PDB file of C-alpha atoms in Angstrom:
ATOM      1  CA  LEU A 227      91.224  27.846  47.055  1.00  0.00           C
ATOM      2  CA  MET A 228      91.862  29.496  43.507  1.00  0.00           C
ATOM      3  CA  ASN A 229      88.365  28.866  42.777  1.00  0.00           C
ATOM      4  CA  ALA A 230      86.931  30.147  45.573  1.00  0.00           C
ATOM      5  CA  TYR A 231      88.650  33.664  45.099  1.00  0.00           C
ATOM      6  CA  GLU A 232      87.649  33.674  41.022  1.00  0.00           C
ATOM      7  CA  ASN A 233      84.105  33.573  42.365  1.00  0.00           C
ATOM      8  CA  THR A 234      84.264  35.921  45.029  1.00  0.00           C
ATOM      9  CA  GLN A 235      85.834  38.359  42.583  1.00  0.00           C
ATOM     10  CA  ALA A 236      82.771  37.932  40.543  1.00  0.00           C
ATOM     11  CA  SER A 237      80.487  38.155  43.475  1.00  0.00           C
ATOM     12  CA  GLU A 238      82.660  41.414  44.707  1.00  0.00           C
ATOM     13  CA  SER A 239      82.380  42.505  41.040  1.00  0.00           C
ATOM     14  CA  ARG A 240      78.619  42.807  41.146  1.00  0.00           C
ATOM     15  CA  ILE A 241      78.245  44.991  44.001  1.00  0.00           C
ATOM     16  CA  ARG A 242      81.346  47.600  44.190  1.00  0.00           C
ATOM     17  CA  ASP A 243      82.246  48.355  40.510  1.00  0.00           C
ATOM     18  CA  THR A 244      80.309  49.947  37.775  1.00  0.00           C
ATOM     19  CA  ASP A 245      78.659  49.515  34.228  1.00  0.00           C
ATOM     20  CA  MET A 246      80.625  51.900  31.642  1.00  0.00           C
ATOM     21  CA  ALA A 247      77.808  51.098  29.444  1.00  0.00           C
ATOM     22  CA  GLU A 248      75.013  51.705  32.001  1.00  0.00           C
ATOM     23  CA  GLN A 249      76.757  55.003  33.598  1.00  0.00           C
ATOM     24  CA  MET A 250      77.062  56.709  29.983  1.00  0.00           C
ATOM     25  CA  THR A 251      73.305  56.291  29.294  1.00  0.00           C
ATOM     26  CA  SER A 252      72.870  58.207  32.797  1.00  0.00           C
ATOM     27  CA  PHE A 253      75.886  60.459  32.291  1.00  0.00           C
ATOM     28  CA  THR A 254      74.603  61.833  29.044  1.00  0.00           C
ATOM     29  CA  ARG A 255      70.915  62.477  30.537  1.00  0.00           C
ATOM     30  CA  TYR A 256      71.522  65.138  33.288  1.00  0.00           C
ATOM     31  CA  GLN A 257      74.472  66.660  30.859  1.00  0.00           C
ATOM     32  CA  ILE A 258      71.104  67.120  28.352  1.00  0.00           C
ATOM     33  CA  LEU A 259      69.121  68.164  31.378  1.00  0.00           C
ATOM     34  CA  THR A 260      72.214  70.244  32.477  1.00  0.00           C
ATOM     35  CA  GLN A 261      71.881  72.760  28.973  1.00  0.00           C
ATOM     36  CA  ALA A 262      67.975  72.809  29.338  1.00  0.00           C
ATOM     37  CA  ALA A 263      67.424  73.955  32.831  1.00  0.00           C
ATOM     38  CA  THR A 264      70.673  76.458  31.801  1.00  0.00           C
ATOM     39  CA  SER A 265      68.685  77.639  28.759  1.00  0.00           C
ATOM     40  CA  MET A 266      65.187  78.008  31.053  1.00  0.00           C
ATOM     41  CA  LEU A 267      67.291  79.923  33.490  1.00  0.00           C
ATOM     42  CA  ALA A 268      68.391  82.332  31.316  1.00  0.00           C
ATOM     43  CA  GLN A 269      64.786  82.859  29.541  1.00  0.00           C
ATOM     44  CA  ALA A 270      63.218  83.344  33.178  1.00  0.00           C
ATOM     45  CA  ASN A 271      66.100  86.136  33.415  1.00  0.00           C
ATOM     46  CA  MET A 272      64.387  87.667  30.012  1.00  0.00           C
ATOM     47  CA  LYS A 273      61.184  87.147  31.540  1.00  0.00           C
ATOM     48  CA  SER A 274      60.552  90.125  33.989  1.00  0.00           C
ATOM     49  CA  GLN A 275      61.894  92.903  31.123  1.00  0.00           C
ATOM     50  CA  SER A 276      58.432  92.714  29.813  1.00  0.00           C
ATOM     51  CA  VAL A 277      56.749  95.140  31.732  1.00  0.00           C
ATOM     52  CA  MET A 278      59.197  98.005  31.255  1.00  0.00           C
ATOM     53  CA  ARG A 279      57.371  98.748  28.287  1.00  0.00           C
TER      54      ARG A 279
ATOM     55  CA  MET B   1      53.742  90.945  37.180  1.00  0.00           C
ATOM     56  CA  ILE B   2      55.962  90.824  40.251  1.00  0.00           C
ATOM     57  CA  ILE B   3      59.354  92.376  39.673  1.00  0.00           C
ATOM     58  CA  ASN B   4      60.636  92.379  43.225  1.00  0.00           C
ATOM     59  CA  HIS B   5      61.373  88.848  43.497  1.00  0.00           C
ATOM     60  CA  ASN B   6      61.070  86.140  40.534  1.00  0.00           C
ATOM     61  CA  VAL B   7      60.032  82.395  41.138  1.00  0.00           C
ATOM     62  CA  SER B   8      60.436  81.214  37.589  1.00  0.00           C
ATOM     63  CA  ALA B   9      64.416  81.602  38.099  1.00  0.00           C
ATOM     64  CA  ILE B  10      63.840  79.902  41.470  1.00  0.00           C
ATOM     65  CA  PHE B  11      62.665  76.757  40.767  1.00  0.00           C
ATOM     66  CA  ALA B  12      64.953  76.499  37.222  1.00  0.00           C
ATOM     67  CA  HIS B  13      68.142  77.189  39.576  1.00  0.00           C
ATOM     68  CA  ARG B  14      67.423  74.502  41.952  1.00  0.00           C
ATOM     69  CA  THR B  15      66.114  72.251  39.498  1.00  0.00           C
ATOM     70  CA  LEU B  16      69.587  73.508  38.036  1.00  0.00           C
ATOM     71  CA  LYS B  17      71.418  72.484  41.131  1.00  0.00           C
ATOM     72  CA  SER B  18      70.392  69.232  41.476  1.00  0.00           C
ATOM     73  CA  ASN B  19      70.956  68.599  37.589  1.00  0.00           C
ATOM     74  CA  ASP B  20      74.652  69.552  37.964  1.00  0.00           C
ATOM     75  CA  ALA B  21      74.880  67.937  41.767  1.00  0.00           C
ATOM     76  CA  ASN B  22      74.005  64.438  40.091  1.00  0.00           C
ATOM     77  CA  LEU B  23      75.543  64.714  37.104  1.00  0.00           C
ATOM     78  CA  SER B  24      79.072  65.156  39.187  1.00  0.00           C
ATOM     79  CA  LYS B  25      78.451  61.609  40.761  1.00  0.00           C
ATOM     80  CA  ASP B  26      77.918  60.000  37.454  1.00  0.00           C
ATOM     81  CA  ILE B  27      81.981  61.586  36.469  1.00  0.00           C
ATOM     82  CA  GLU B  28      83.074  60.065  39.876  1.00  0.00           C
ATOM     83  CA  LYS B  29      82.175  56.631  38.741  1.00  0.00           C
ATOM     84  CA  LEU B  30      82.609  56.737  35.144  1.00  0.00           C
ATOM     85  CA  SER B  31      86.381  58.277  36.175  1.00  0.00           C
ATOM     86  CA  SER B  32      87.109  55.525  38.596  1.00  0.00           C
ATOM     87  CA  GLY B  33      85.092  52.342  37.441  1.00  0.00           C
ATOM     88  CA  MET B  34      84.398  51.694  40.860  1.00  0.00           C
ATOM     89  CA  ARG B  35      80.323  52.345  41.604  1.00  0.00           C
ATOM     90  CA  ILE B  36      80.690  52.957  45.442  1.00  0.00           C
ATOM     91  CA  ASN B  37      83.322  55.658  45.628  1.00  0.00           C
ATOM     92  CA  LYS B  38      81.934  57.021  48.986  1.00  0.00           C
ATOM     93  CA  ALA B  39      79.900  55.650  52.046  1.00  0.00           C
ATOM     94  CA  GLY B  40      76.393  55.931  51.851  1.00  0.00           C
ATOM     95  CA  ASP B  41      75.751  55.321  48.152  1.00  0.00           C
ATOM     96  CA  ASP B  42      75.317  51.706  49.205  1.00  0.00           C
ATOM     97  CA  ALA B  43      76.077  51.284  52.685  1.00  0.00           C
ATOM     98  CA  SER B  44      75.569  47.617  53.446  1.00  0.00           C
ATOM     99  CA  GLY B  45      77.155  47.047  49.936  1.00  0.00           C
ATOM    100  CA  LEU B  46      80.168  48.766  50.589  1.00  0.00           C
ATOM    101  CA  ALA B  47      80.819  46.999  53.949  1.00  0.00           C
ATOM    102  CA  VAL B  48      79.852  43.623  52.127  1.00  0.00           C
ATOM    103  CA  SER B  49      82.459  44.520  49.470  1.00  0.00           C
ATOM    104  CA  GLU B  50      84.991  45.326  51.840  1.00  0.00           C
ATOM    105  CA  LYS B  51      84.471  41.918  53.551  1.00  0.00           C
ATOM    106  CA  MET B  52      84.437  40.646  50.110  1.00  0.00           C
ATOM    107  CA  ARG B  53      87.967  42.525  49.428  1.00  0.00           C
ATOM    108  CA  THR B  54      89.212  41.327  53.252  1.00  0.00           C
ATOM    109  CA  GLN B  55      88.659  37.349  51.419  1.00  0.00           C
ATOM    110  CA  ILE B  56      89.960  37.959  48.182  1.00  0.00           C
ATOM    111  CA  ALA B  57      93.167  39.311  49.287  1.00  0.00           C
TER     112      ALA B  57
ATOM    113  CA  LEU C 227      97.145  63.841  51.904  1.00  0.00           C
ATOM    114  CA  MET C 228      95.238  64.021  48.464  1.00  0.00           C
ATOM    115  CA  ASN C 229      91.593  63.013  49.697  1.00  0.00           C
ATOM    116  CA  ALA C 230      91.451  65.610  52.154  1.00  0.00           C
ATOM    117  CA  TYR C 231      92.734  67.988  49.999  1.00  0.00           C
ATOM    118  CA  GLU C 232      90.076  67.666  47.455  1.00  0.00           C
ATOM    119  CA  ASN C 233      87.489  67.132  50.244  1.00  0.00           C
ATOM    120  CA  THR C 234      88.640  70.602  52.407  1.00  0.00           C
ATOM    121  CA  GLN C 235      88.395  72.623  49.109  1.00  0.00           C
ATOM    122  CA  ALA C 236      85.112  71.549  48.254  1.00  0.00           C
ATOM    123  CA  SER C 237      83.895  72.906  51.927  1.00  0.00           C
ATOM    124  CA  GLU C 238      86.010  76.054  51.040  1.00  0.00           C
ATOM    125  CA  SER C 239      84.756  76.818  47.609  1.00  0.00           C
ATOM    126  CA  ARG C 240      81.022  76.312  48.914  1.00  0.00           C
ATOM    127  CA  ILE C 241      81.263  79.535  51.694  1.00  0.00           C
ATOM    128  CA  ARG C 242      83.473  81.326  49.227  1.00  0.00           C
ATOM    129  CA  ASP C 243      82.544  80.774  45.380  1.00  0.00           C
ATOM    130  CA  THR C 244      79.590  82.124  44.046  1.00  0.00           C
ATOM    131  CA  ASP C 245      76.789  80.225  41.992  1.00  0.00           C
ATOM    132  CA  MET C 246      76.759  82.186  38.717  1.00  0.00           C
ATOM    133  CA  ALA C 247      73.325  80.942  38.022  1.00  0.00           C
ATOM    134  CA  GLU C 248      71.633  82.757  41.239  1.00  0.00           C
ATOM    135  CA  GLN C 249      73.784  85.481  41.098  1.00  0.00           C
ATOM    136  CA  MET C 250      72.705  86.485  37.255  1.00  0.00           C
ATOM    137  CA  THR C 251      69.247  85.936  38.459  1.00  0.00           C
ATOM    138  CA  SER C 252      69.406  88.653  41.848  1.00  0.00           C
ATOM    139  CA  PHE C 253      71.647  91.003  39.144  1.00  0.00           C
ATOM    140  CA  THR C 254      69.099  90.684  36.480  1.00  0.00           C
ATOM    141  CA  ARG C 255      66.570  91.624  38.997  1.00  0.00           C
ATOM    142  CA  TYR C 256      68.027  94.707  40.365  1.00  0.00           C
ATOM    143  CA  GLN C 257      68.803  96.347  37.111  1.00  0.00           C
ATOM    144  CA  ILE C 258      65.353  96.197  36.109  1.00  0.00           C
ATOM    145  CA  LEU C 259      64.341  98.257  39.840  1.00  0.00           C
ATOM    146  CA  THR C 260      66.928 100.856  38.750  1.00  0.00           C
ATOM    147  CA  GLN C 261      65.353 101.262  35.623  1.00  0.00           C
ATOM    148  CA  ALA C 262      62.072 101.176  37.442  1.00  0.00           C
ATOM    149  CA  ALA C 263      62.593 103.965  40.024  1.00  0.00           C
ATOM    150  CA  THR C 264      64.311 106.091  37.184  1.00  0.00           C
ATOM    151  CA  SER C 265      61.204 105.801  35.035  1.00  0.00           C
ATOM    152  CA  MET C 266      59.066 106.843  38.037  1.00  0.00           C
ATOM    153  CA  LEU C 267      61.861 109.436  39.294  1.00  0.00           C
ATOM    154  CA  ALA C 268      61.197 111.642  35.893  1.00  0.00           C
ATOM    155  CA  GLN C 269      57.540 111.470  36.359  1.00  0.00           C
ATOM    156  CA  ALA C 270      57.831 112.653  39.973  1.00  0.00           C
ATOM    157  CA  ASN C 271      59.292 115.652  38.262  1.00  0.00           C
ATOM    158  CA  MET C 272      56.595 116.457  35.607  1.00  0.00           C
ATOM    159  CA  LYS C 273      54.044 115.716  37.988  1.00  0.00           C
ATOM    160  CA  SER C 274      55.222 119.537  39.943  1.00  0.00           C
ATOM    161  CA  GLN C 275      54.393 121.106  36.644  1.00  0.00           C
ATOM    162  CA  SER C 276      50.850 121.056  36.845  1.00  0.00           C
ATOM    163  CA  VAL C 277      49.501 123.461  39.329  1.00  0.00           C
ATOM    164  CA  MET C 278      52.583 125.428  38.338  1.00  0.00           C
ATOM    165  CA  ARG C 279      50.266 126.754  35.153  1.00  0.00           C
TER     166      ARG C 279
ATOM    167  CA  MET D   1      33.923 107.820  28.707  1.00  0.00           C
ATOM    168  CA  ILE D   2      34.461 106.835  32.544  1.00  0.00           C
ATOM    169  CA  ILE D   3      37.921 107.600  33.531  1.00  0.00           C
ATOM    170  CA  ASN D   4      37.252 106.846  36.813  1.00  0.00           C
ATOM    171  CA  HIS D   5      38.093 102.861  36.118  1.00  0.00           C
ATOM    172  CA  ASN D   6      40.113 101.223  33.321  1.00  0.00           C
ATOM    173  CA  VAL D   7      37.841  98.117  32.945  1.00  0.00           C
ATOM    174  CA  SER D   8      39.898  97.123  29.789  1.00  0.00           C
ATOM    175  CA  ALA D   9      42.863  97.450  32.167  1.00  0.00           C
ATOM    176  CA  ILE D  10      41.453  94.833  34.488  1.00  0.00           C
ATOM    177  CA  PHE D  11      40.377  92.708  31.988  1.00  0.00           C
ATOM    178  CA  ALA D  12      44.055  92.956  29.963  1.00  0.00           C
ATOM    179  CA  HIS D  13      45.415  92.359  33.977  1.00  0.00           C
ATOM    180  CA  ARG D  14      43.731  89.261  34.391  1.00  0.00           C
ATOM    181  CA  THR D  15      44.169  87.755  30.904  1.00  0.00           C
ATOM    182  CA  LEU D  16      48.275  88.697  31.115  1.00  0.00           C
ATOM    183  CA  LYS D  17      48.179  87.224  34.645  1.00  0.00           C
ATOM    184  CA  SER D  18      46.675  83.720  33.898  1.00  0.00           C
ATOM    185  CA  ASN D  19      49.668  83.322  30.959  1.00  0.00           C
ATOM    186  CA  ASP D  20      52.251  84.377  33.435  1.00  0.00           C
ATOM    187  CA  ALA D  21      51.103  81.429  35.772  1.00  0.00           C
ATOM    188  CA  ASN D  22      51.233  79.191  32.512  1.00  0.00           C
ATOM    189  CA  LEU D  23      54.527  80.470  31.467  1.00  0.00           C
ATOM    190  CA  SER D  24      55.974  79.556  34.859  1.00  0.00           C
ATOM    191  CA  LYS D  25      55.017  76.321  34.852  1.00  0.00           C
ATOM    192  CA  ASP D  26      56.288  75.530  30.749  1.00  0.00           C
ATOM    193  CA  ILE D  27      59.592  76.705  32.254  1.00  0.00           C
ATOM    194  CA  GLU D  28      59.165  74.401  35.014  1.00  0.00           C
ATOM    195  CA  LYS D  29      58.635  71.089  33.249  1.00  0.00           C
ATOM    196  CA  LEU D  30      61.267  71.822  30.678  1.00  0.00           C
ATOM    197  CA  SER D  31      64.030  72.690  33.461  1.00  0.00           C
ATOM    198  CA  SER D  32      63.486  69.731  34.989  1.00  0.00           C
ATOM    199  CA  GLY D  33      62.991  67.376  32.247  1.00  0.00           C
ATOM    200  CA  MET D  34      59.758  65.795  34.225  1.00  0.00           C
ATOM    201  CA  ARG D  35      55.833  66.693  33.236  1.00  0.00           C
ATOM    202  CA  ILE D  36      54.658  66.785  36.983  1.00  0.00           C
ATOM    203  CA  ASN D  37      56.794  68.679  39.442  1.00  0.00           C
ATOM    204  CA  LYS D  38      54.430  69.367  42.390  1.00  0.00           C
ATOM    205  CA  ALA D  39      51.688  68.334  43.759  1.00  0.00           C
ATOM    206  CA  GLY D  40      48.761  69.822  41.962  1.00  0.00           C
ATOM    207  CA  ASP D  41      50.075  69.414  38.494  1.00  0.00           C
ATOM    208  CA  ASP D  42      48.333  65.614  38.497  1.00  0.00           C
ATOM    209  CA  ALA D  43      46.811  64.344  41.584  1.00  0.00           C
ATOM    210  CA  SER D  44      46.511  60.734  40.037  1.00  0.00           C
ATOM    211  CA  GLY D  45      49.514  60.581  38.017  1.00  0.00           C
ATOM    212  CA  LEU D  46      52.250  61.514  40.724  1.00  0.00           C
ATOM    213  CA  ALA D  47      50.317  58.260  42.521  1.00  0.00           C
ATOM    214  CA  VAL D  48      50.633  56.293  39.521  1.00  0.00           C
ATOM    215  CA  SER D  49      54.346  57.340  39.013  1.00  0.00           C
ATOM    216  CA  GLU D  50      55.591  56.598  42.298  1.00  0.00           C
ATOM    217  CA  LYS D  51      54.069  53.280  43.104  1.00  0.00           C
ATOM    218  CA  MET D  52      55.871  52.212  39.403  1.00  0.00           C
ATOM    219  CA  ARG D  53      59.081  54.368  40.890  1.00  0.00           C
ATOM    220  CA  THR D  54      58.732  51.553  44.100  1.00  0.00           C
ATOM    221  CA  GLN D  55      58.482  48.567  41.485  1.00  0.00           C
ATOM    222  CA  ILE D  56      61.536  50.085  39.914  1.00  0.00           C
ATOM    223  CA  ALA D  57      63.774  50.238  42.336  1.00  0.00           C
TER     224      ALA D  57
END
């Protein structure tokens, strides 16, 4: 009984639990993508002022 | 140039909308430590995991 | 109780709280239009002084 | 001078016109973090990429 429980817990971990090392890499991906899409949004705002002159 | 509407800001914000949205799901798993926080992310994976947790307990 | 609180708040915040990025876009758009009409409003006043010579 | 038509302004409008369209796509790619966004940036590159995305999944 103990051996089967230990194996199913290892089996359940793969499907259910997450990798902290893996998800941090993806987490930092969007965080930089967040700032970049934010920075370019401000640039697009400033774009239309150039026609006033 | 067209001043009544600006599509450069339209695409950037919709890009930002999904950039922020997925970042929220990243925090969910990192804080929880469980890869399947809600149903739909892995429907059969969550379902099988519950049957496994049923047996584990 | 805690779970429904988080989900109900999300449903409420979507219809109530505003997206600052999208709102800044319309705000910056309307600001330029105000300078646009003000520039044209000034011109229409100086236009009337042609035949009045 | 022929004041009736502003030929230089016609040329300047088109030269400025293309730069704005070029500028918009540059803002598109910097915001999304990907070089291809819509069908029209690269017909072949999208088709090659999507198969690779199928392989990666």
